[PDB]
Design an enzyme around this catalytic site. Structure first.
Site, PDB file in Angstrom:
ATOM      1  N   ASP A  69      -2.355   4.380   7.359  1.00  5.84           N
ATOM      2  CA  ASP A  69      -1.230   3.397   7.640  1.00  5.84           C
ATOM      3  C   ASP A  69      -0.973   3.678   9.267  1.00  5.84           C
ATOM      4  O   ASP A  69      -0.504   2.569   9.818  1.00  5.84           O
ATOM      5  CB  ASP A  69      -0.014   3.316   6.786  1.00  5.84           C
ATOM      6  CG  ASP A  69       0.786   2.222   6.913  1.00  5.84           C
ATOM      7  OD1 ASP A  69       0.124   1.286   7.284  1.00  5.84           O
ATOM      8  OD2 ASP A  69       1.806   2.119   6.565  1.00  5.84           O
ATOM      9  N   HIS A  70      -0.881   4.695   9.583  1.00  2.09           N
ATOM     10  CA  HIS A  70      -0.367   5.088  11.031  1.00  2.09           C
ATOM     11  C   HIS A  70      -1.447   4.768  12.006  1.00  2.09           C
ATOM     12  O   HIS A  70      -1.346   5.076  13.125  1.00  2.09           O
ATOM     13  CB  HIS A  70       0.285   6.528  11.040  1.00  2.09           C
ATOM     14  CG  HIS A  70       1.548   6.437  10.118  1.00  2.09           C
ATOM     15  ND1 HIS A  70       1.697   7.020   8.944  1.00  2.09           N
ATOM     16  CD2 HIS A  70       2.690   5.885  10.363  1.00  2.09           C
ATOM     17  CE1 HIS A  70       3.078   6.729   8.712  1.00  2.09           C
ATOM     18  NE2 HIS A  70       3.565   5.958   9.578  1.00  2.09           N
ATOM     19  N   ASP A  72       0.877  -1.087  -0.040  1.00  5.10           N
ATOM     20  CA  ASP A  72       0.068   0.102   0.011  1.00  5.10           C
ATOM     21  C   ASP A  72       0.836   1.152  -0.001  1.00  5.10           C
ATOM     22  O   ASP A  72       0.598   2.328  -0.737  1.00  5.10           O
ATOM     23  CB  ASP A  72      -0.991   0.029   1.254  1.00  5.10           C
ATOM     24  CG  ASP A  72      -0.374   0.259   2.524  1.00  5.10           C
ATOM     25  OD1 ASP A  72       0.593   0.898   2.732  1.00  5.10           O
ATOM     26  OD2 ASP A  72      -1.027  -0.163   3.628  1.00  5.10           O
ATOM     27  N   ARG A  77       1.651   5.265  -4.553  1.00  3.44           N
ATOM     28  CA  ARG A  77       1.844   6.296  -5.074  1.00  3.44           C
ATOM     29  C   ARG A  77       2.241   6.301  -6.472  1.00  3.44           C
ATOM     30  O   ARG A  77       2.475   7.336  -7.357  1.00  3.44           O
ATOM     31  CB  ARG A  77       3.864   6.195  -4.831  1.00  3.44           C
ATOM     32  CG  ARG A  77       4.131   6.120  -3.246  1.00  3.44           C
ATOM     33  CD  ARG A  77       4.873   7.480  -2.677  1.00  3.44           C
ATOM     34  NE  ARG A  77       4.844   7.362  -1.383  1.00  3.44           N
ATOM     35  CZ  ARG A  77       5.945   6.774  -0.758  1.00  3.44           C
ATOM     36  NH1 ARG A  77       6.999   6.027  -1.326  1.00  3.44           N
ATOM     37  NH2 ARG A  77       6.130   6.894   0.608  1.00  3.44           N
TER      38      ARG A  77
HETATM   39  C1  POV Z   1      11.235 -10.894  18.977  1.00  4.07           C
HETATM   40  C2  POV Z   1      12.714 -11.180  18.681  1.00  4.07           C
HETATM   41  C3  POV Z   1      13.422 -10.243  19.397  1.00  4.07           C
HETATM   42  C4  POV Z   1      14.760  -9.995  18.371  1.00  4.07           C
HETATM   43  C5  POV Z   1      14.977  -8.640  17.716  1.00  4.07           C
HETATM   44  C6  POV Z   1      14.410  -7.470  18.678  1.00  4.07           C
HETATM   45  C7  POV Z   1      13.900  -6.432  17.542  1.00  4.07           C
HETATM   46  C8  POV Z   1      13.149  -5.301  18.693  1.00  4.07           C
HETATM   47  C9  POV Z   1      14.073  -4.084  18.430  1.00  4.07           C
HETATM   48  C10 POV Z   1      13.753  -2.729  18.303  1.00  4.07           C
HETATM   49  C11 POV Z   1      11.981  -2.364  18.086  1.00  4.07           C
HETATM   50  C12 POV Z   1      11.806  -1.589  16.927  1.00  4.07           C
HETATM   51  C13 POV Z   1      10.452  -1.202  16.621  1.00  4.07           C
HETATM   52  C14 POV Z   1      10.023   0.266  16.167  1.00  4.07           C
HETATM   53  C15 POV Z   1       8.750   0.241  15.306  1.00  4.07           C
HETATM   54  C16 POV Z   1       8.355   1.556  14.712  1.00  4.07           C
HETATM   55  C17 POV Z   1       6.936   1.822  14.599  1.00  4.07           C
HETATM   56  C18 POV Z   1       6.187   2.459  13.341  1.00  4.07           C
HETATM   57  O1  POV Z   1       5.588   3.178  13.342  1.00  4.07           O
HETATM   58  O2  POV Z   1       6.498   1.494  12.137  1.00  4.07           O
HETATM   59  C19 POV Z   1       5.479   0.646  11.687  1.00  4.07           C
HETATM   60  C20 POV Z   1       4.534   0.146  12.667  1.00  4.07           C
HETATM   61  O3  POV Z   1       5.224  -0.965  13.285  1.00  4.07           O
HETATM   62  C21 POV Z   1       4.281  -1.971  13.156  1.00  4.07           C
HETATM   63  O4  POV Z   1       3.318  -2.331  12.371  1.00  4.07           O
HETATM   64  C22 POV Z   1       4.639  -3.102  14.468  1.00  4.07           C
HETATM   65  C23 POV Z   1       5.098  -2.750  15.608  1.00  4.07           C
HETATM   66  C24 POV Z   1       5.946  -3.696  16.349  1.00  4.07           C
HETATM   67  C25 POV Z   1       6.039  -3.482  17.854  1.00  4.07           C
HETATM   68  C26 POV Z   1       5.118  -4.737  18.559  1.00  4.07           C
HETATM   69  C27 POV Z   1       5.837  -5.892  18.988  1.00  4.07           C
HETATM   70  C28 POV Z   1       5.810  -6.547  20.432  1.00  4.07           C
HETATM   71  C29 POV Z   1       5.464  -7.823  20.522  1.00  4.07           C
HETATM   72  C30 POV Z   1       6.463  -8.618  21.694  1.00  4.07           C
HETATM   73  C31 POV Z   1       5.950 -10.065  21.986  1.00  4.07           C
HETATM   74  C32 POV Z   1       7.091 -10.937  22.182  1.00  4.07           C
HETATM   75  C33 POV Z   1       6.629 -12.114  22.828  1.00  4.07           C
HETATM   76  C34 POV Z   1       7.825 -12.989  23.528  1.00  4.07           C
HETATM   77  C35 POV Z   1       9.105 -13.467  22.530  1.00  4.07           C
HETATM   78  C36 POV Z   1       8.628 -14.761  21.608  1.00  4.07           C
HETATM   79  C37 POV Z   1       4.670   1.723  10.805  1.00  4.07           C
HETATM   80  O5  POV Z   1       4.545   1.018   9.479  1.00  4.07           O
HETATM   81  P1  POV Z   1       5.461   1.615   8.021  1.00  4.07           P
HETATM   82  O6  POV Z   1       6.620   2.381   8.475  1.00  4.07           O
HETATM   83  O7  POV Z   1       4.279   2.393   7.269  1.00  4.07           O
HETATM   84  O8  POV Z   1       5.738   0.545   7.140  1.00  4.07           O
HETATM   85  C38 POV Z   1       6.283   0.700   5.734  1.00  4.07           C
HETATM   86  C39 POV Z   1       7.672   0.815   6.048  1.00  4.07           C
HETATM   87  N1  POV Z   1       8.415  -0.451   5.359  1.00  4.07           N
HETATM   88  C40 POV Z   1       8.299  -0.300   4.015  1.00  4.07           C
HETATM   89  C41 POV Z   1       9.758  -0.754   5.933  1.00  4.07           C
HETATM   90  C42 POV Z   1       7.782  -1.771   5.696  1.00  4.07           C
END
Ligand code: POV
Ligand code: POV
Lengths: 368, 368
Positions: free
Chosen positions: B117-118, B99, B104
């Site tokens: 999207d947000h 999307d 675009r």
């Molecule tokens: C898990 C393993 C760990 C190892 C790694 C650690 C990693 C973590 C480290 C760092 C964390 C960095 C996070 C920053 C997110 C940015 C927010 C945002 O607005 O972006 C996006 C929202 O994002 C989402 O849609 C999902 C949000 C994820 C948080 C929920 C996870 C908690 C679950 C935990 C449960 C665990 C249970 C126990 C575990 C089994 C907005 O979407 P967009 O930007 O419009 O998309 C387009 C851009 N694109 C083209 C790039 C696609």
């Protein structure tokens, strides 16, 4: 932000404001001559705010002494402090009438002449309610000692609420002079006679006799609050139906509603009974909080602005709420005293900063 | 006031806004080709918001089914729903990339393409956190099942908080794609093998193995939150050090701080254990509340305006607070469901009203 609670435009509307009143009732015409007779002996160089402060200080000191000899409301203080607190109330009323009248004598009429009487009057309302409720020994009926006292705040707020939608103070056929004479009467009655007569029930209907004056007061509250609310809901000055600042007419009621609702919750929820072991600190803490809220509404009606719910003094009662939301995590008496200290300092700092800013902007001394 | 949540000037700044992003990390370049390859088969007449809604609906339905078979987090659902929810997460990520990219292609780039999207991404964040936390069976360690999940909100907020002081989304070296692939990995691992392997401790250090992925996630949270906070405390665009709307940089943190603090209190105070008998309704209720708060911050950063604490959806959790401030006056499960209903309706009404107003002001259909 501490030392400048107002903006330049707010100072401009405060300079633009003019004081007005439209109140005549029964008990003033016998007292106008008496007030003038006490007035002419006062030298003309005395500042009006000095008169206000002297009256407030005398009332606060006497009521604090009476609170010291009776922290609760189930015991009798010696009669001399009853007479002294009655004389304090009478001299307070006399000095308030004097300050309103003799200040006009110099082009002192200024807006710090109000935004003061309406702050000192708020403090005196709280202290006078506590003093009258102690002298009648309302601790045997604690609910009344709460409810009546907070009605003693709410009516006051309604009065200023009235001004907020009319720009002019309407007194009504029963008003402050009636309450003040009734309270000096109850003070001198509990002084000359023993206070135990307030426990003497009437054989006609088995009523404790602490109920008759409080229901007379409640009925008068009904008259005055209906008189206020009629123009609260039917006075539109700044717009078609809004207030003098354009804000919705029901907005300022939220402040006193939140204060009274917080008082109701902290009354009813308290597992350790804060009242039956230590009242008159609780009512004084909501007294300082209600004092700041009413001072803010004073500033709002004589300087055309919107009311704001966000205030720092709600940290005072709110602390109790948090310490009551959990279990007593800290002993409730100690957190109540902490709320006393924090609310008192925030109110005093706000009020002194307000008067200092008003004095400095107008390049006028607080005392002339 | 319901059907017009924005003003004309706010619509003007929204029309003025332009989208920007500066994020490249490790896992995108292998996925860009895959996303384009799934993209070209999609017909050009499909609206982008239809793609967003389809992805959100698939994810919500699959996670709701998985919640239905496991309302708590101490029991195993059949493996087919694990695989289905994993496929839902993957198709959701694919449709979000699609999307962003295929929209675009038409001068559809418009600001309703975001402010969506947000919003859909916020809802998907909450639902994905609940789904991942269920599939790992975190009910045996309920604190983590709370804390980790709310960290899954807070990081998201920090990301948008970053945008609020820079006007452009900075991703970082580890970002959404890493979490999404890690969560589809944990889903397929709990699907193909039995979920009881999550109870198999390591003989090296006697760790339950539900702790290793959550601490990896927590460490990555530390990296990303430090990366965000550096420019939160050192990015000044609209003024010398303020945000793009002139508001103080620490103001938007108050919203998520209040949400997390309310969650902490209602966790700890509850005399009847709401969690150990019925979680995933509590996290969904703060999910809807956090969804509206994050949507408001989205509107605030792509339309230059100050944040407001006053919101109606805080009536949702706050109700619990009141029913916990007293004794349980109403049974806590029932008031939690009432909070579900009221917060869900207020969030849905706000979001649909927002999209309808944006569509009507620009004279553009929601689907093109
Ligand atoms: C898990 C393993 C760990 C190892 C790694 C650690 C990693 C973590 C480290 C760092 C964390 C960095 C996070 C920053 C997110 C940015 C927010 C945002 O607005 O972006 C996006 C929202 O994002 C989402 O849609 C999902 C949000 C994820 C948080 C929920 C996870 C908690 C679950 C935990 C449960 C665990 C249970 C126990 C575990 C089994 C907005 O979407 P967009 O930007 O419009 O998309 C387009 C851009 N694109 C083209 C790039 C696609
Ligand atoms: C008690 C017998 C009942 C019978 C009669 C019922 C009567 C009640 C009916 C109706 C009530 C009408 C009240 C309206 C007040 C207006 C508020 C205001 O701003 O004015 C003034 C503040 O006023 C004060 O200074 C004192 C406030 C009194 C309230 C506290 C009493 C509660 C104690 C209860 C404890 C009871 C314990 C149990 C009982 C033993 C502002 O001052 P001013 O305007 O600048 O002054 C100049 C104007 N002047 C020149 C005119 C002077």
């Amino acid at each position: 932000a501490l030392s400048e609670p107002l903006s330049a435009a707010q100072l401009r509307r405060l300079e633009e404001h003019r004081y007005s009143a439209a109140g005549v009732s029964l008990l003033e015409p016998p007292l106008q001559l008496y007030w003038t007779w006490l007035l002419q002996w006062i030298p003309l160089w005395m500042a009006p705010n000095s008169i206000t402060l002297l009256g407030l200080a005398v009332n606060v000191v006497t009521t604090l002494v009476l609170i010291s000899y009776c922290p609760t409301a189930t015991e009798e203080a010696p009669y001399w402090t009853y007479l002294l607190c009655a004389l304090g109330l009478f001299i307070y009323q006399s000095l308030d009438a004097i300050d309103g009248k003799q200040a006009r004598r110099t082009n002192s009429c200024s807006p710090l002449g109000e935004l003061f009487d309406h702050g000192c009057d708020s403090l005196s309302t709280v202290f006078m309610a506590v003093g009258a409720s102690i002298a009648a020994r309302l601790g045997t009926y604690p609910d009344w000692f709460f409810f009546c006292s907070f009605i003693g705040m709410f009516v006051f707020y309604c009065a200023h609420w009235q001004t907020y939608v009319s720009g002019m103070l309407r007194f009504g056929k029963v008003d402050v002079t009636e309450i003040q004479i009734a309270l000096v009467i109850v003070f001198v009655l509990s002084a000359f006679g023993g206070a135990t007569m307030w426990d003497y029930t009437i054989p006609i209907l088995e009523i404790k006799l602490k109920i008759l004056p409080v229901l007379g007061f409640l009925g008068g509250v009904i008259f005055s609050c209906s008189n206020y609310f009629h123009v609260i809901l039917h006075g539109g000055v700044g717009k078609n139906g809004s207030t003098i600042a354009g804000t919705s007419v029901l907005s300022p009621g939220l402040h006193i509603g939140l204060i009274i609702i917080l008082a109701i919750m902290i009354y009813k929820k308290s597992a350790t009974d804060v009242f039956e072991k230590h009242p008159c600190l609780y009512i004084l803490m909501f007294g300082c909080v209600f004092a700041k809220v009413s001072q803010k509404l004073v500033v709002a009606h004589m300087t055309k602005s919107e009311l704001y719910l966000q205030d720092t003094v709600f940290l005072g009662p709110g602390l109790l709420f948090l310490d009551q939301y959990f279990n007593n995590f800290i002993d409730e008496y100690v957190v109540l005293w902490m709320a006393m200290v924090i609310s008192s300092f925030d109110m005093v700092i706000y009020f002194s900063a307000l008067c200092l800013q008003i004095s400095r902007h107008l390049h006028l001394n607080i005392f002339k």
